[PDB]
Assembly symmetry: D2
Homo-oligomer: 99 residues x 4
């Protein structure tokens, strides 16, 4: 039941190109315990109606969770993911690199 720090990965479903519709993902992996605060950001503002998968687990109880939303990438808009867990001293913000 020994605690593990989460691994945060912010990416888009398909290679980024403006004007069209796509998906913004925030993959949180290999953490313990279960209770985790995950939020998706658009220009510093929290995104409304974010979808999330069910909490997947391994034999030694390491958790895997995915937070995703439908979005239109533009030249103006900046996207990020905010994660808060018991292992972290402060909430972590991981920015999305349109690359």
């Amino acid at each position: 039941m020994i605690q593990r720090t989460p691994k945060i990965q912010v990416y888009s479903r398909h290679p980024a190109e403006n004007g069209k519709s796509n998906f913004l993902n925030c993959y949180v992996s290999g953490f313990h315990p279960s209770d985790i605060e995950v939020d998706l950001l658009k220009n510093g503002e929290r995104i409304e109606k974010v979808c999330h998968s069910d909490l997947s687990f391994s034999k030694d109880w390491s958790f895997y969770l995915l937070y995703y939303t439908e979005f239109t990438p533009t030249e103006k808009d900046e996207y990020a993911c905010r994660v808060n867990h018991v292992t972290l001293s402060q909430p972590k913000i991981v920015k999305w690199d349109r690359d």
Copy 2:
């Protein structure tokens, strides 16, 4: 691999209350083949950000799928679910009954 018509069920996660946040679900079950068009409606208009589960299956390939969205019910707003499948002669609209 034999034609099965889908069973549509429209319901809310918790007992509905005006002004209180809830979830609107559209459960589609026991259908074949896999390809199905499911849409959640608000006053006749298609809801933008709709979340969906993964397609679960049985031994004889009968499919089960859930379409859900976060919503705040009001007295004015009417909700429904539109389903289109290869078995159906025309798309079926199932209204949400909160009574």
Copy 3:
């Protein structure tokens, strides 16, 4: 984070009939914390090959989990589900009824 005792439900996927293949389910619901020990039993003995769904959660962190296995029911064999959690002093055994 305030504790919640689990609700255990033991059932078969389809109506049971001897000699024919089925699935034995153990649905554990509305519990906190996450760490739960769920085991499916055959004549008091632990079943080695058991599948499980993914841990679903609510706003206040109440958990929902399903443990299932493929089985061929007989009139000799008895089935049950053993659950151990931090909220309980001794593990709870819930028997399956045909």
Copy 4:
């Protein structure tokens, strides 16, 4: 509806080591239609204890499915995955390369 041949990947969850518990995975991806026969083998014999994920899909209906089982690797035992689909003339056997 267009036809797509499945991509089969056979791998272990953690790097394989004799006597230590592991998981054998058979990842089937980018196929159409849905109906697919997947089986995990041990020395040519079909494994009875097999768990499987839910069928995930894209906009153009391309399917993704994972078949997994708990196993203890030895130097003597050989593992493989057998897949049979409508696109294939005969079932395909993909062996698990340990190294």
